[PDB]
Design a protein around this ligand. Structure first.
Ligand code: NA
Ligand code: NA
Ligand code: NA
Ligand code: NA
Ligand code: ZN
Ligand code: ZN
Ligand code: ZN
Ligand code: ZN
Ligand code: ZN
Ligand code: ZN
Ligand code: ZN
Ligand code: ZN
Lengths: 367, 367, 367, 367
């Protein structure tokens, strides 16, 4: 009944954006804790601190210990309080960013996120995904506000391994299908209402950008460079997908992703790789026409995303393992109930096992 | 001049429908003879009797001796009379179902049919096909009413061998072409009049569902599971095709099927396999454009239906054998005279021999 | 411990041999019952009776009623006794030939067999295979002597459908592998002893002739003509294979063939088609090297013999059905115990299921 | 200067061996601690305890907590002492087996290992591989004696996912090349001397069995069954490879495997998958001829082992990451110095980067 859209205050993207972070950060605060692991500090630290200094922004670097846990969060909280910082900057990968969101939340301060990879649509969202230590989906943890600012330095991203860009396209790939399923069901998004037209359209624009630009961008990043295609994909993997999923909705593909986290065989594939397959399984679950399945199979195969259980490490008589995936995907509270029809574990198992068969037949025709 | 459509009273389909048969059967009678062979009783007996018991429906199981013959029919009639049953349930394959229709006819009682395979469109019809003992088409035997109720448990069907689903798609495949040929000829259907718009449209919907869903359903059933595609094909093979053929019309493809029953080389292929080829031959007989022939050849090849005489077991100098097929297909009273043009044995022989050549050339291009 | 080889007295082959049958038949008797069904009498009757008349051989035609049953046998016995015939001629297919062997056995008279097809290696042997009426292997029935004379008219055979020649090559294909397995096991043949060197060498010569001549012969028979390649294959399918199997030995392939007779899905494929697949399964059972499996797969695929369960009509979850095949193939008294190692139902099931997989992978590479 | 070969006392293999474990275990002790995790107890527990009971062998089950750590080892030690057990049985995967070896070592008792998968050649060896918690190779830990007995139930193994059999073939694949390199260098094995002729020949027999039987076995295990090919591969992955590597020698491939453990991108691939690629890199390092590289590439591609960095999860500008792999592979004490020539990090980096290119070119020709 209410339609709600939420968003980070400002999203900034472009080549060498890191060198301009000080103008934008200054507008929120004149003193920041900078959370980054050591690899990221060596990569990005001199440019960032340089930018901050140049705009009269004070900064204390803090070494992040790799994991997003209450201990590290409480620790970084105390450190912040002791130097008197009035803002948090997170720089690097997902665990660094999720940690910076939490620090800023508990200290009630503004946060600037600087992803150094574009492999998931997490950065813009008022969200963190908690797993167990064994790698098994635990909970969506939801903040009451979005990050203030998200800064995407495309030059940095295009030097990161192409596999991480592909995984982000895999995560982005589900956005349209989950958003349109929710929209059809009149389901409530994580923003707390029905989807706006805006959030659905951004989600569709995500899918359409991936199809137009995904191969061109992959080729550029394999060469280590930024073209306009790369700029478009980075927007698609980050802003379009991030607003689409948070303000428009999650459904079967992410629930199926969560369900796959109960199998050890997958546990090291990247989130977006698994979500791509979960999207395929969603297509079978909702009975998408063959032309649309073909389009998705050709896209995933062309950029290197998995289209069979074997490419996810799963072989043999996986009947029981996929029934376990299916039960977990259908747990109370999971997003798969946002589909515009009733879903059961047996239906999910069917969709998975069948998607595997579709992708295996597609591989045999090679194209 | 009159348009007539007839139908079973109720058609019910879905996963685990067998477990709900008691509510629906109760509405017609509170006491049933259950006709099933031993394999089917072992497969389905506990679920069915369980359902019946749970709704206060009384039941006597009777072991079916495999064949639909007057002896078995008269026998099962006497047995029914002796326990006082007020309804018949047929469960299993075609011969079991055809037997239950006859028992219910002679005893004038309501009948519930529970097909455990979806390999022909017989179940809904007021009809049985009589062969000789040598396997040669004898007659259409026509009842004055349709079965009261037809129950399709999709979970059971999806565990049956994929070859039986394919054969049902083969039988369903002819439905549109025969119905539209009859419609064009203003021919009289087995329902006794000209076709309604309804029966023709269901027949077209049959063809269109096969093209959209046939491969997807085949893949799911190869995995042993039910998806929405499987639900659609089962409806297509059963209800759409059954109403289409009975109330819209048969024409060349089924007459050609009947004609093939004079050759020993074919006699063990499934009905729908032969009907698929008979459909191809119908396309040549009525001079369908090449694009439509291509579509059908690609469909049959993609799901595993025969497109040449050699795939039907026929080789060598089959000139004389196909002339025998052609004479038999053109016998007085056969459905091939429902074509909107004059058909002769020589024309039928021509269409068969030519269809074989089309399918052999298609195989050489592989696609 | 004893080595024994047995043989028909004389085997005669060549184009238009039917027209010379009188010289050879005269040497055994001057008066024959001629057993042939009506189709065969119309095809071959005038040439045969012509030949017999021309050499002063008396003859009474008797119409064979299609089946090899004690009734028909006892009947034809009485008829023979009443005209005073001193010899039997069988002309046509396997059931006609098996009937003539029995008539000659019970009446203790000489028999001339004239096969009009070369689709099995039965004709030369002191044997008949009894099935049930449901098509299920019953028993080997063994006579105490071989037919006196076997006459192969190659012109007649080359006008018969190519599929029957292929099926005979399929039956012949097993001969070497079964003979060499028996030889290795020191197993006793149906001739009652260990194999001679002669019977084993004929069996090997069978395999080697099929590989050299099989495609060339198939091409000629597709054109309806006799070349030297066709003459060689007919000898291979008839004399080489017949002596090889009777005097050298049967083993897994024929036991597996027998086991497949418990499935309805196969029951109409020709004997040699099934035996070809049973040969493949034997290769897996005895762990033949991949190069030898490849050779056989390429031969069967090149001439049109089945290399998968699906080409034998078997699909879906055939785990239980193949366990039934395997149990039946291992029954007490079956030939599979002639293998040079211990065989169990589980091993046979394994070999079958694995052979199917080999042949399916071969089909995917097309070659 | 001394040649030394060591071995488990007895290696036993075959279908349903688990049901015969009691006769063999009884010969070493009449009372065992049985170490198995819960999944394995549910799978194998009733058969094993059944066998033990039937031969008068006493047994206390102990639940293994998944990890091979001193804590779990010391714990299981105390438990053993308290019930008075005179032997240890390990049943399941590598961590369970490595734990049972340690328990038996510290308690100085006999040990029976029952692997339920054939994915590495660890079981027969007097060895455990210690990693860090971050998954990074730590040390070879060496016991002074081999396990007393190793029991391979082939029926159990053939029901395990095919991917685990493939990974064991990947581990086995390196055995010949590392053994022959050591032999050539006159390097000292983990058994403490120069290689015997016996250990080298078993290693070669390993390679030759993989090439003859690997595809056939893979096909059988995909069907869930045991053929002779599967029996041969299980021997190859377990006994042949285990003696080959321990008593003949490790060299570049396993050192390169260890070096890859410093990258997160690989950390979840199975040991044998990584070792297969490390074998390829060894081929380039020692300049194997192209025909031998082709043979290995075709084998790995045909069974599903990785032949490029991308199939190991590594993409982009991996120059620095592969230099890190190369440094770690060349650490003091690593097995790569067993090569018959001087190896440097730069040479290893070269071999890796070049192997990737070979495998990528091979993929482009598809074959
Ligand atoms: Na998404
Ligand atoms: Na129809
Ligand atoms: Na034979
Ligand atoms: Na090894
Ligand atoms: Zn500060
Ligand atoms: Zn995601
Ligand atoms: Zn009753
Ligand atoms: Zn039909
Ligand atoms: Zn006579
Ligand atoms: Zn035979
Ligand atoms: Zn104890
Ligand atoms: Zn290893």
């Amino acid at each position: 009944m209410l339609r709600i859209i939420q968003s980070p205050g400002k999203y900034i993207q472009g080549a060498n954006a890191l060198a301009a972070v000080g103008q934008y950060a200054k507008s929120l605060a004149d003193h920041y804790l900078v959370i980054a692991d050591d690899f990221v500090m060596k990569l990005a630290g001199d440019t960032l601190m340089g930018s901050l200094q140049q705009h009269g922004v004070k900064h204390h670097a803090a070494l992040f210990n790799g994991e997003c846990c209450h201990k590290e969060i409480d620790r970084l909280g105390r450190e912040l309080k002791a130097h008197g910082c009035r803002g948090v900057i997170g720089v690097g990968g997902g665990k660094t960013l999720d940690t910076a969101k939490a620090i800023a939340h508990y200290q009630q301060l503004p946060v600037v996120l600087i992803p150094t990879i574009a492999s998931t649509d997490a950065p813009t969202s008022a969200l963190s995904v908690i797993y167990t230590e064994q790698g098994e989906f635990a909970e969506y943890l939801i903040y009451p506000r979005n990050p203030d600012m998200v800064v995407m330095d495309v030059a940095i991203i295009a030097k990161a391994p192409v596999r991480l860009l592909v995984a982000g396209m895999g995560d982005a790939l589900s956005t349209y299908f989950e958003a349109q399923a929710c929209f059809d069901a009149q389901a409530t998004s994580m923003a707390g209402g029905k989807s706006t037209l805006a959030a659905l359209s951004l989600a569709r624009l995500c899918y359409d950008t991936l199809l137009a630009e995904g191969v061109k961008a992959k080729l550029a990043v394999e060469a280590g460079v930024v073209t306009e295609a790369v700029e478009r994909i980075i927007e698609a993997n980050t802003y379009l997908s991030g607003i689409g999923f948070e303000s428009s909705g999650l459904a079967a593909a992410h629930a199926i992703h969560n369900g796959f986290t109960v199998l050890e065989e997958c546990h090291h594939l990247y989130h977006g790789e698994k979500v791509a397959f979960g999207t395929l399984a969603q297509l079978v679950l909702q009975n998408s026409p063959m032309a649309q399945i073909e389009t998705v199979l050709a896209f995933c195969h062309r950029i290197g995303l998995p289209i069979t259980l074997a490419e996810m490490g799963v072989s043999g008589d996986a009947v029981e393992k996929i029934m376990a995936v299916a039960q977990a995907s259908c747990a109370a509270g999971e997003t798969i109930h946002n589909m515009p029809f009733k879903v059961t574990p047996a239906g999910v198992q069917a969709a998975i096992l069948t998607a595997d068969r579709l992708g295996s037949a597609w591989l045999q025709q090679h194209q």
